[PDB]
Design a protein around this ligand. Structure first.
Ligand SMILES: Nc1ncnc2[nH]cnc12
Ligand SMILES: Nc1ncnc2[nH]cnc12
Ligand SMILES: [Zn+2]
Ligand SMILES: [Zn+2]
Lengths: 516, 266
């Protein structure tokens, strides 16, 4: 029920079991569907592009991110200056909790506005610049559109505010945690001094001397730890002046750094662009028709289908460039020999030859030759009754094969292959999870010796959820209250050594002699 | 029992196969009214022929994805319709007569209908279907418009359906291959791999035809059901009690007679 089980490589170098207590609120946060989706994505990513060496590192990073997410969720969840502050924080928490509902409402508003705009009409006379008017007999749809546009802009503003109040803390925490790791265990700003090729590092250089550097990250003693680690090499006074520490006593800059980080953040940039187009809709209503493409980021199945084609975007660009190159080569071949045929004017007085200019012939080929279903010979003058019959029929047939069939079947093959590769990726991750234990790596064949052995092992002995719960339990529990094993694991975690995770061993493998 | 009869009638009326047969009869009756209603029964081949059913399952496997991509096509064609309605009203004219020109993009609904009707069904985008762009100041803009339409709307968004169908065929083939290989390589009841049984010649075949046959298990279950109680042996009573309590521990999992008694069998 509320009891957690784990296995570690203890100080005695043997697999040891540790028991602890799991909270109801934390468990509910665990079966929250958002956390379930995050776990699914993390498992897929690590299994697909992760080695066994850094797998524990990625797992611990994901556990820390999840812990911060559940802390934020618990904070925002709810079971004259003071009153206004309470109202403001309640409103902010409501926006944070209803961010997703607001986004869905924004999508519905975009669809409604587009549907109403689908009754656009053009009339030169007022209802040479044309006075645009919307035609409809009912009469209420113009005020409906005005109210919907105002309400949509409002919804976008609340969406941005909710994102800033909800997901920005995750980005800030991740960036601060990574900076702390690179400062302490790597000395990135102490010895390495990145060669101006890391704009992120250059930007994080500013926040070093800020007082409240660890605003969200739990380890507030990062400055003291890095000082103790790098004193004898760098200099105590110089470390103190670098970090802003008061050595003798042993935030505008931070706000600027945070604003830079959030402005660089891609999701915040996308929401800002959404708001900018929502505002520009008030200027030119058709700008609201550019929000309909938010379905790509909204609907999961649409996102997967579009990922199927963006998987090979580089290859598609390369093959489009190859098509442009080959069409240019055919354009040169035509410009040097076949100027007669590219004529599109029936009038004899003013013939229109579309290959006299190289740019014009290339444009003609790129425009009509590719978009024709039978090459360029079917599109331009007939080759019969000429001395160049064989040359021109060879030209047309080679164009048809190499330019239309093959070079528009390559795109279809790329898309089909991308669908296939994605399907095998999903199959491989599912089969690996089914056949191996994530934490230890021992195959399921050993565990299936006893009935339901693998299920019992993965639900009681080596549960990654239990490991995450134990880690958050250590973080929450006050120090000097740890048991011996808890202190051992806490010291290992602070030193960032993942030897305590069982690798290729388990309690059953260790004590089968007595268990049998 | 009127209540039981009402409940049974509700269940059978909800039943899908009974509903389909009722619809078959309704269309058969309506054939007497309008004979061409008998031409709607020809699609019963889909439910009749096994190979046709499999082929149609190959496309209904990704019906949700096909609906999603058709909606995406509608969205992108609407976006192109907006782009055309705001800038390119001149070109969408299909009337040669000068007295009464027919512009097919003055109305947003009309331009969207024109795009959905002819632009997608054209083999070369919409630029080949509507007025030529040459001899105009918007040459570059309109050629970019036409080429982007051709790539994003015809090539990619009608190759996605073909890719989906091919991928569905592939996934179904791997499903069949996987089930066949799993049945060949593992024992269904116990789960022990065939590698152990192939120690002796024909070992896996003998195990799956004499020791752990699912047909034999079903025959034993029906034998217990048929045989009168108080006539069961001790083992039969044990299995009957387990079945009544719905506990499947008696099924061998990860163990067998050979694994248990190889010490004496060897
Ligand atoms: N240790 C583990 N915990 C949870 N799910 C798993 N799937 C495979 N190994 C697992
Ligand atoms: N136990 C079993 N009975 C029948 N067919 C099988 N195929 C694999 N295992 C089998
Ligand atoms: Zn394990
Ligand atoms: Zn068996």
């Amino acid at each position: 029920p509320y009891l957690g089980r784990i296995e570690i490589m203890g100080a005695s170098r043997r697999i040891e079991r540790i028991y602890f207590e799991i909270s109801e609120t934390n468990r509910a946060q665990w079966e929250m569907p958002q956390v379930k989706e995050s776990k699914r994505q993390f498992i897929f990513d690590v299994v697909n592009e992760g080695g066994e060496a850094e797998k524990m590192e990625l797992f611990v990073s994901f556990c820390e991110d999840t812990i911060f997410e559940m802390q934020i969720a618990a904070q925002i969840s709810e079971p004259f200056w003071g009153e206004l502050e309470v109202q403001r924080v309640k409103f902010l928490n409501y926006l944070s909790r209803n961010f997703y509902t607001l986004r869905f409402l924004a999508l519905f508003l975009a669809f409604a506005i587009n549907f109403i705009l689908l009754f656009y009409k053009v009339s030169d006379s007022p209802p040479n610049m044309v006075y645009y008017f919307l035609e409809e007999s009912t009469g209420y749809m113009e005020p409906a559109l005005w109210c919907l546009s105002l309400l949509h802009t409002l919804v976008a503003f609340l969406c941005i505010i909710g994102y800033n109040c909800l997901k920005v803390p995750l980005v800030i925490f991740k960036r601060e945690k990574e900076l702390a790791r690179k400062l302490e265990f790597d000395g990135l700003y102490i010895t390495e001094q990145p060669g101006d090729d890391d704009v992120k590092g250059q930007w994080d250089r500013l926040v070093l001397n800020t007082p409240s550097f660890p605003s969200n990250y739990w380890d507030k003693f990062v400055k003291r730890k890095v000082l103790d680690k790098h004193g004898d090499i760098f200099g105590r006074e110089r470390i103190a002046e670098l970090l802003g520490m008061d050595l003798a006593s042993l935030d505008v800059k931070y706000q600027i750094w945070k604003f830079g980080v959030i402005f660089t953040d891609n999701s915040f940039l996308y929401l800002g662009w959404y708001m900018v187009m929502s505002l520009l809709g008030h200027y030119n209503n058709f700008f609201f028709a550019a929000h309909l493409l938010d379905i790509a980021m909204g609907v999961k199945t649409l996102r997967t289908i579009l990922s199927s084609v963006t998987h090979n975007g580089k290859q598609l660009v390369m093959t489009v460039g190859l098509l442009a190159v080959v069409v240019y080569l055919y354009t040169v071949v035509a410009f040097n020999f076949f100027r007669k045929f590219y004529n599109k004017s029936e009038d004899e007085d003013e013939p229109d030859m579309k290959c006299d200019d190289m740019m014009t012939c290339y444009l003609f080929h790129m425009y009509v030759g590719v978009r024709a279903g039978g090459g360029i010979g079917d599109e331009i003058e007939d080759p019969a009754g000429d001395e160049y019959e064989l040359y021109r029929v060879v030209f047309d047939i080679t164009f048809f094969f190499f330019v239309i069939v093959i070079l528009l079947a390559i795109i279809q093959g790329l898309i089909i292959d991308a669908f296939g590769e994605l399907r095998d990726q999903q199959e491989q991750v599912k089969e690996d999870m089914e056949t191996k234990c994530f934490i230890c790596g021992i195959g399921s064949d050993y565990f299936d010796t006893t009935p339901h052995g693998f299920e019992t092992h993965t639900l009681e002995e080596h549960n990654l959820a239990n490991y995450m719960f134990f880690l958050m339990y250590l973080i929450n529990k006050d120090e000097t209250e740890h048991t011996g094993q808890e202190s051992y694991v806490w010291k290992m975690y602070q030193e960032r050594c993942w030897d305590f995770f069982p690798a290729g061993d388990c309690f059953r493998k260790q004590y089968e002699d007595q268990l049998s």
